[PDB]
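Record format v2
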Amino acid sequence: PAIVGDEHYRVAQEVIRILQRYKDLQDIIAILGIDELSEEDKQLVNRARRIERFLSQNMMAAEQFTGQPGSTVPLKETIEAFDKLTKGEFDHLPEQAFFLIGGLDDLAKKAESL
Amino acid sequence: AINVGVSVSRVGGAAQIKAMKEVAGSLRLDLSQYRELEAFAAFASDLDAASKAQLDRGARLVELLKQPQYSPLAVEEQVVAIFLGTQGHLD
Amino acid sequence: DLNVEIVAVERELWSGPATFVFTRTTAGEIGILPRHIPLVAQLVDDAMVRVEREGEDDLRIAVDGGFLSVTEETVRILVENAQFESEIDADAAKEDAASDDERTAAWGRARLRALGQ
Amino acid sequence: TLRELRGRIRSAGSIKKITKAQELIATSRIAKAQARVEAARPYAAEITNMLTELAGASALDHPLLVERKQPKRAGVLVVSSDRGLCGAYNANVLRRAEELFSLLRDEGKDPVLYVVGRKALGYFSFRQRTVVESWTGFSERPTYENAREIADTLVNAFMAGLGVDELHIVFTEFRSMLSQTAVARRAAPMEVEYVGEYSFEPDPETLFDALLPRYIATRVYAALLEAAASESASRRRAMKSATDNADDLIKALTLAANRERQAQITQEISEIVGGANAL
């Protein structure tokens, strides 16, 4: 929080906490199936799935094959998107809406057209 | 005796015919899932049915990859051998 | 109509609406109708329960060590073990009724009674 | 030695897998045990209701509801595991049993033991107090046919009064997956508890003399079911601990095998360049 902002450092620590919980739960998910988790543990995994997907990006190296342009996401837009996404403000969207997407305005564009 | 899942080829799919890619692409995933699940071989009744069907599949794929010496299979024959496994006809 | 509940020691084994229910008790056989006095009674050792149903065919039960209880709103049968006529086996029940152990001979006769014999 | 350390890493890396497997199996079995507890719960509640109605109508002169004139002996039923690896589960059970024994012998009753589970049967084989009867094969999956026999044997030892003046059960009460304790309950003689505000066939006394042996059986069955849930919950907790300890052992051994690898190579070089410098 000395080099990056306090907001950046908080958001990145929450994203790591969620992905650490999901990495611990993936054993239960594989062995017992999702139904073995509580309502709160499945409420976490529903977010964690969408967070790990939203770390994927349509990038200028993929423009060779998909033909769709590679996206740049500003640092402030990245922080503000993961701050909303970790608080769960996008829990109602399907996981497919978050694959290979170029920031929050583009998330809305994909989700409304899916 | 090939220890798959530490053994690797950096050339990858470019060295396979299309029939071998379509048939065997899932094979590494099924053997990595079986290599996780083998610790539950003692609890096959308690294990969830979705992964019980990965454990018995993995055991039948590991049998499928065994081969006597001086018996090399032509690609036309091992495409069909891997097909028996990954498409579940061995199940 | 009767709210009938057959509750086993380990399971809530069956529940539904009924028009009528018949059971055999240590005070002879007894039928219960949609209005009945509040009752407690122990079933016989070789007991059967027959439940009349409005939506389908009647339901047939074999019961071990059951206790009938009735209140104005519902009938509760509290049971150690129970088996439907659709799940009893005629050879197994016949072999159990031939056994020398009194409880096993009772449970054999009970499953034979649910099978109409 | 690097060969020894590599062997110990291979060992600990198999043990980490085998304890993680059994932590996940215990995480399944606590859900199965809670399902069997909640499936048995409505029967226990309705026998309790029927017993309160019959006792309200009864004269209450039944043997299981009266204190014996001489407190000659007390029966203690101790519920414990057959399988191992459960961690402190059996230690807590047997510590609550030995607290109960210190209390009973302080009142003036010598306890006589009934035991469920092979581990307490081993503990009371080592400590020279006898066990009157035991059962072993079902502590992880208790069926009602087992609790029937246990409660028959306990009640027959009470009514024999060679017999006991009271009897108790010692077991762990599952209250959450994160919280269990060993508890001791007096099963007989039962208290009666008067509280503020039916036809019986053939008679309320005849039913009450038939139903109390069944109530003791359902209260023993509910104790075996909560014991089996808390066994699985302690096996989960203790096998999570054994997995984290096997991972901290793989870490410490991997660090030692690396320090030995680097020392073996450094030493081998030092000997080679020493032999080049000598020539």
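The interface with chain A takes residues 33, 36-37, 40, 47-48, 50-51 of chain B (CB under 8 Å).
The radius of gyration of chain B is 14 Å.
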